[PDB]
Amino acid sequence: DLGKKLLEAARAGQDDEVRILMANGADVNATDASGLTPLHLAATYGHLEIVEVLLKHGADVNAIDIMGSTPLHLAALIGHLEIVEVLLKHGADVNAVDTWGDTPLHLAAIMGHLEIVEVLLKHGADVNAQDKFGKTAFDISIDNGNEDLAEILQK
Amino acid sequence: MRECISIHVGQAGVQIGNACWELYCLEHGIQPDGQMPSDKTIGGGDDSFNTFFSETGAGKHVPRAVFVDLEPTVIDEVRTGTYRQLFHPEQLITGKEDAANNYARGHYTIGKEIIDLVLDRIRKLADQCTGLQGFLVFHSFGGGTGSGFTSLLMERLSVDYGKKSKLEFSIYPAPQVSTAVVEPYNSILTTHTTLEHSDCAFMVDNEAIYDICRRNLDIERPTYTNLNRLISQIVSSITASLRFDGALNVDLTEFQTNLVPYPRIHFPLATYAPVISAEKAYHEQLSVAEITNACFEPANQMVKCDPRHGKYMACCLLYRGDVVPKDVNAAIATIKTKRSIQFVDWCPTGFKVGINYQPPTVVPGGDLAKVQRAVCMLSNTTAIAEAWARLDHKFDLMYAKRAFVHWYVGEGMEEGEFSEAREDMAALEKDYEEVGV
Amino acid sequence: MREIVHIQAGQCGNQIGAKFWEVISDEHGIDPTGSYHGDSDLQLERINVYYNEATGNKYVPRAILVDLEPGTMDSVRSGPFGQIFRPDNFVFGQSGAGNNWAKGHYTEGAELVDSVLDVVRKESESCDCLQGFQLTHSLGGGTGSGMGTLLISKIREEYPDRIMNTFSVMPSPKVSDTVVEPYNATLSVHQLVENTDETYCIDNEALYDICFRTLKLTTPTYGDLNHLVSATMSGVTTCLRFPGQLNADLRKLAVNMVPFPRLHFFMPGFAPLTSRGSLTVPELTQQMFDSKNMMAACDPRHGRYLTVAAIFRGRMSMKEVDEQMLNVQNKNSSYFVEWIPNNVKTAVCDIPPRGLKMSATFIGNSTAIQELFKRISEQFTAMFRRKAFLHWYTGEGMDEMEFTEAESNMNDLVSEYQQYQDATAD
Numbered sequence A: 001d002l003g004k005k006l007l008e009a010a011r012a013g014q015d016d017e018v019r020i021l022m023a024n025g026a027d028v029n030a031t032d033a034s035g036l037t038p039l040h041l042a043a044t045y046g047h048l049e050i051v052e053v054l055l056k057h058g059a060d061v062n063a064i065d066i067m068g069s070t071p072l073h074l075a076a077l078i079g080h081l082e083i084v085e086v087l088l089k090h091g092a093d094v095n096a097v098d099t100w101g102d103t104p105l106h107l108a109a110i111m112g113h114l115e116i117v118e119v120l121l122k123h124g125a126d127v128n129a130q131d132k133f134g135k136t137a138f139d140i141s142i143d144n145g146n147e148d149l150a151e152i153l154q155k
Numbered sequence B: 001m002r003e004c005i006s007i008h009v010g011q012a013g014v015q016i017g018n019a020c021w022e023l024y025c026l027e028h029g030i031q032p033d034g035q036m037p038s039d040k041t042i043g044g045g046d047d048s049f050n051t052f053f054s055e056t057g058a059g060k061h062v063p064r065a066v067f068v069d070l071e072p073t074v075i076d077e078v079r080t081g082t083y084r085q086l087f088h089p090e091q092l093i094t095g096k097e098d099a100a101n102n103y104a105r106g107h108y109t110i111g112k113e114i115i116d117l118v119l120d121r122i123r124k125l126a127d128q129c130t131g132l133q134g135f136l137v138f139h140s141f142g143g144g145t146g147s148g149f150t151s152l153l154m155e156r157l158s159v160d161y162g163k164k165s166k167l168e169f170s171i172y173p174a175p176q177v178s179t180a181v182v183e184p185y186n187s188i189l190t191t192h193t194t195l196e197h198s199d200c201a202f203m204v205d206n207e208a209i210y211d212i213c214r215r216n217l218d219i220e221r222p223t224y225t226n227l228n229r230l231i232s233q234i235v236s237s238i239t240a241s242l243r244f245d246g247a248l249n250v251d252l253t254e255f256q257t258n259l260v261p262y263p264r265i266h267f268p269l270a271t272y273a274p275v276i277s278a279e280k281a282y283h284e285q286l287s288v289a290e291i292t293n294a295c296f297e298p299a300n301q302m303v304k305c306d307p308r309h310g311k312y313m314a315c316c317l318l319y320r321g322d323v324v325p326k327d328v329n330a331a332i333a334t335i336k337t338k339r340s341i342q343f344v345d346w347c348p349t350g351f352k353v354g355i356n357y358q359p360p361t362v363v364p365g366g367d368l369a370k371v372q373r374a375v376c377m378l379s380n381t382t383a384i385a386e387a388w389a390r391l392d393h394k395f396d397l398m399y400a401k402r403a404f405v406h407w408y409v410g411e412g413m414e415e416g417e418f419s420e421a422r423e424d425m426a427a428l429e430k431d432y433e434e435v436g437v
Numbered sequence C: 001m002r003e004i005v006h007i008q009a010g011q012c013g014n015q016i017g018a019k020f021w022e023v024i025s026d027e028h029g030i031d032p033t034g035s036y037h038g039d040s041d042l043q044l045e046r047i048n049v050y051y052n053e054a055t056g057n058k059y060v061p062r063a064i065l066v067d068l069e070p071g072t073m074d075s076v077r078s079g080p081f082g083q084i085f086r087p088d089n090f091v092f093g094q095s096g097a098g099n100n101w102a103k104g105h106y107t108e109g110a111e112l113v114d115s116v117l118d119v120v121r122k123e124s125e126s127c128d129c130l131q132g133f134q135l136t137h138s139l140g141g142g143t144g145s146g147m148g149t150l151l152i153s154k155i156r157e158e159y160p161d162r163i164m165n166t167f168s169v170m171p172s173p174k175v176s177d178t179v180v181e182p183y184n185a186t187l188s189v190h191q192l193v194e195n196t197d198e199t200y201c202i203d204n205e206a207l208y209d210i211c212f213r214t215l216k217l218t219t220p221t222y223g224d225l226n227h228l229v230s231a232t233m234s235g236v237t238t239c240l241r242f243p244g245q246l247n248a249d250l251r252k253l254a255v256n257m258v259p260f261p262r263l264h265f266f267m268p269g270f271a272p273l274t275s276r277g278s279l280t281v282p283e284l285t286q287q288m289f290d291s292k293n294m295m296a297a298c299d300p301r302h303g304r305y306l307t308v309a310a311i312f313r314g315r316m317s318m319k320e321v322d323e324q325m326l327n328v329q330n331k332n333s334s335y336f337v338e339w340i341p342n343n344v345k346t347a348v349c350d351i352p353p354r355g356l357k358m359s360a361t362f363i364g365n366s367t368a369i370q371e372l373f374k375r376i377s378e379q380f381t382a383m384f385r386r387k388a389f390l391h392w393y394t395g396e397g398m399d400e401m402e403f404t405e406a407e408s409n410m411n412d413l414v415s416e417y418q419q420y421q422d423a424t425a426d
Ligand SMILES: Nc1nc2c(ncn2[C@@H]2O[C@H](COP(=O)(O)OP(=O)(O)OP(=O)(O)O)[C@@H](O)[C@H]2O)c(=O)[nH]1
Pocket: B009, B010, B011, B012, B013, B015, B016, B069, B070, B098, B099, B100, B101, B102, B106, B140, B141, B142, B143, B144, B145, B146, B147, B171, B173, B174, B177, B178, B179, B180, B183, B206, B224, B225, B227, B228, B231
């Protein structure tokens, strides 16, 4: 199965191996046991080159895994600023909600990725989005006393 | 002549004992090297000061004292101090690690690897005596050694010296000069385990001595030096009957006979007067009636309590200096009726008086001024139950949440002993209530 | 109770440890060669607590240096005091850890824990009466965090009655935006609750907020952060290095500051807040109880103080300190637990730190420290829910059950702080 090799290629960042597999008809939208696409891993491990090439070959930018994680959820959590803007440029849902009720704005605010928080807000991130505990992105900045994060959410 | 052996346990016991023996030598005319020029008999004697001082062949007067501490910092100052020649070098016993303000370390673990050595050195001092009558034990309540090791030592002395008396000078913890937050714990634990092995205990409230230094002596920030100097003055007034001639409390058994009506309530209240700052050498000389009146004021007491709350079971007046027995009876007769002095229904309602016509001795460097007459009142009143109530309250505030308890359980002690000690303190307070307080 | 063995692990451990040996050696009057160039005494009465005598008017720090990365081996030597350390104490491995807590605790670190334990042996035998151990490190990395906690557990097995004291540096995205630090920190706090007697929680989050917002440092460097660290470590160890009475026992400190065995995480404070190259008694007592002077990113006004220890340094009236300390406990009486009577200790030292006539060092055991653990537990949960980078750890022997057990223990630690925060005496 070339889809399994495509999952491993996007994880390690092998740009050459991804092109050879797609030229032989590898499933660009293949998934692993938990529903992770080659775009999830490339966005998780910060392989911007593979992310762009995958999006040029029929990759679903809003694909979710079993836990409802989109490629934008993982890129915002891990903190890949260049990948987040590319995903948003290709129609990623900035307000996608996973099974835990979190949005990309939640994960970037929790992990302290202030640059990503600013980028998500300028693309229509809902600041009133509550998670499975009623907490919003602004509630997270007040509960742990993040003054740098609170001022950004008061643009 | 019946010898008495003094035992100083822990830092508070050593530093107070060091100040008491310096004052003893000034009262008896003993030099720092042990020389007593006013001793016509060299090599021994049957005198009354020999109860506290043995005599070597060369006329050296060595105190019958033992200094014990689980760490050498405090006793090393005695080995280098002014009286480094006075004490027996082998009677200054030091350990390596202290009890860390933990009653369990002082009693169960750290204190158990030196208790056999301390007893053998105490045995050596007892073999020299011809008529040993008991021991004087100086220690603190809050310290780990002063509480843990003392409770262990008192248990051992009751088995090896079952027919001898045992008196205590206890240091009651005060928040102003406290060193540990668990001192209420240690005070309850040592009291319960020693209540059976102690015949009579004089408690010294550090907050009482602290306030006296601030008020009467104008000492803004009293230190351990200012406290122990005043404490040694009061300790000497209590043990003067054992070291000089007299007819009141001439031996340790008489302390128990005159002050302790029942075995458990053996905590007399001590009051001393007058306390005048050394900055006033030309002060007015207080009369016998004015110093006797001061003994009934709660501001001159050694334990913070209100004797007007309770009732008396025994009262002893120990005068020192120019005091005529006619003026005492007159002073008694007035301060017997003009005050609210209530004795219990089952007591003679009398005042025992003993006079020593030598004025008190002050040490060079002290804060007290010379006086022509002073008095130390020893009374057993149920009002001293206030001291146990204050201590049991702070004990209960912490033990309800089991705070700091894991420190004690981790050193060979069981949590069940905390309950047994507190239950015994509840019976002690009830013992004072069944008499009247 | 006298000698203290110091150990510094990882980059952060050797970085904040070197500054500790440079500041205290100046107070005692010790040059990089080891000679005593002080003009006043009292600098050598308690010198053996952190130093030894190496013959020739020489004083060598009782320090042991360990890091898997051999680059720190050259970084310490290139320092101004990087020659007073002994060449027999430097222990450095082959390759680093790469912020992997598993490489420090199970693989690379375990292949070096015996090399460190051998030099701790010859150092312990040089001590006449050892009282405990001291470890500086960070919790975000892999060596100082993974191997540090492992070395703590190994020294404890051979020295069960000796005190273990650590200066742990909490991770923060504002200084290091590495997403695997909440993993290594949580896995380390799980170890520090069991194998330590007292831990000084130094928070890089708080250290950044002090430099950036109070000291106006737009881009604070690690040298700026370590200036506050070296100032706190000197103050918390003041009663250990100078007379000033109050003995110098690490166990007496633990008995009076740790009311419950798991709650041995202290919040330190310092005042006044000075910079690298840049008051009265009512002022020192004021800033100490201020959240802007705490070295942990927590507001003490959000919790209750269990035990408090304050150290004042310099020439000042011991009477006035008693007035201000007893008064602060009244204006903020509702922020101290009432079931621990006399839970505040005051200490004054004659010798102040360099460049300051007066100072103050705050050591608090407040329930408000849960806000720090709530911060890392949230970052841990956000990463662990997505199983992100979890294979970095499962491929080194460690397995998934340890992450959940480490998460279950910290939330239990937070539950204990809130439990004693709402407890009343009645
Ligand atoms: N009056 C007076 N009290 C003292 C003195 N030294 C210590 N204390 C009191 O003793 C209590 C603590 O007991 P310590 O004697 O210091 O401790 P320890 O007996 O040496 O036992 P460790 O805990 O092992 O050190 C404190 O509350 C002090 O107030 C002193 O010199 N004079």
